[model samples]
Target: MVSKGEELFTGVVPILVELDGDVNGHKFSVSGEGEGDATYGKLTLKFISTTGKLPVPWPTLVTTLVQCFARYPDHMKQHDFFKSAMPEGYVQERTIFFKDDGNYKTRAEVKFEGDTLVNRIELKGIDFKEDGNILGHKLEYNYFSGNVYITADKQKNGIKANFKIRHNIEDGGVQLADHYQQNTPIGDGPVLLPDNHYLSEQSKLSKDPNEKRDHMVLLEFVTAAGITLG
Candidate 1:
């Protein structure tokens, strides 16, 4: 019996993205891929960076994602699960802020220029259990989890970016101090993520600045979340 306050909804999140500028102009692209359990309360993560391939079309991707979620033993229909994963009319836009004085006081906005394609896929309330059987443990750690997916694209003098990150607030005393705590006032209200807690990187990639090439690609994306107060 979960209460309304405990339900996961929209929450204020601090996000960041960085690119490596060393390798041949730029050599890599990255994105976050993972799932979190709302029931059993466990998270699994994967990072992806690829070259030379086009993603599935927007509407087609939706249908494929719906079919993927159908295999989960959840009472809610896959379409409804998708709907509940994110709010309606949620546009993928965030103010790119500068942290020079240890705050997002400066805005470095990037526009998609022309013919931009944006898509986000999320599904909630899927059943998952850790591999406890191999540990000679009969107890099952079950939880209701969900996933979100997005990637990056680029334009002239600007970039299309996306980011995804999941921090464990209920760390069992193992994660570093770089994450959220269970008692943290996250979804309870809007809060600025501590400066140190902001995920950041200085990566390197390469592409010809003057012209386009057949094998060169640059992409970026981000996703951030915490519990929400209804």
Candidate 2:
């Protein structure tokens, strides 16, 4: 089975999506690292861009950014394995943050169990600018969490699992999926279901058999938003 350290470093893979219904074939790669003390855990995500082959130009880059962020929050929360392992109150303290040397750094924190995980994350250090003009702003808040588990047996291949949940908070209130929910039963791996309804026949044909190996499974999802190209 995969060790806790390995799982923390690898985090989870994500499925890609097109923003604004434009299929320019834009692609991205993402990975994360996490370390924790007895009372806290910190995770960081890195993003990179890939080539796009669409004939038409995208309307705006912001759309892509928003879609990427929206999907990631859902991806984390929807899976089941992540939830069962971490559970609620397991991690006492958590922080999720972003940094930009050219702009202000943004971050949020949660003290689990002391307050509802869904209501605890508070945003800090939000600043925006347009054409060298600074725009005063307040940071927005959101709820996010992930959990994972591993099971190994000498007799057969082992299993690793994860689940996550995220709450989108706006100036008015919070938002949750209407019918969708987190913690559903799903396999752990880059491609969990062979018959996933979203993939095309040709695309499915290209899936590598080595996607899962040695007790390590990949969860395919898209990367985060707002990172610039190098």
Candidate 3:
């Protein structure tokens, strides 16, 4: 069994995001390593930075997340909102789409990059799904990047933000992963697990039709930077 104060690591953690094929959206949180305490572990988050409004309230979002934690009883308990069984360096990838008020569809490509510290990010696309279609629906692309960072003191948590300059709307062009998203102010905790393994397992489990989407975001924790842990 795992013991407290023990550090864990996984390689290639992937996370997935689902979208409505349009704009307007919500923010989701992904956290790692808080299995027993109320709050004490690495975390990260992803969301759309749009001028449009969201369909749900912030509190509803938090509530939905709490419920998702209920799925993993051994690793995730009521107070243990930040625990993940993901091995270090796990990679988690998630894709999501939303509809803008203007009738255009927006798609986000989210994934954990590298084999350590698992930076969680989202890239927006200008293309829209013409008819609830599957693959081959052309995607006009725009790119952006976000990363997770923890505080040195381990007291609070926060995010960092950076923006990308050029916009690519065609294939074989620029991808979201290439952008230079900025960072926000520092919060708390130390940067943990710099890989993508844990994220990969989470993505596999999240793909099930019965899985809860909103809760998926809640399961993630955010550091001042955008790196996700649990």
Best by TM-score: 3
- Expressed as tens digits, the lDDT of each residue in 95-146 for candidate 2 is 2111221121111121123211211211122232322111211222222322
Q: What is the lDDT, from 0 to 100, of the residue 209 in candidate 1?
A: 57
**Cα lDDT over the full model 3:** 0.25
Quote the lDDT for 12 in model 3.
Answer: 22
The weakest ten consecutive residues by lDDT in model 3 span 196-205
Q: How far is candidate 3 from the true structure (C-alpha RMSD, Å)?
A: 14.3
Candidate 1 to truth, TM? 0.21
lDDT of 2: 0.21
Clashes of each: 25, 18, 103
Tell me each candidate's TM-score. Answer: 0.21, 0.21, 0.22
lDDT of 1 at 53: 26
What lDDT score belongs to each candidate, Candidate 1 first? 0.21, 0.21, 0.25
Looking at candidate 2, what is the lDDT of residue 88?
A: 28
Evaluation by lDDT, superior candidate among 2 and 3: 3
Per-residue lDDT of 141-183 in model 3, one digit per residue for the tens? 2222223221222232211112222223245442222222112
The worst-scoring run of ten residues by lDDT in candidate 2 lies at 196-205
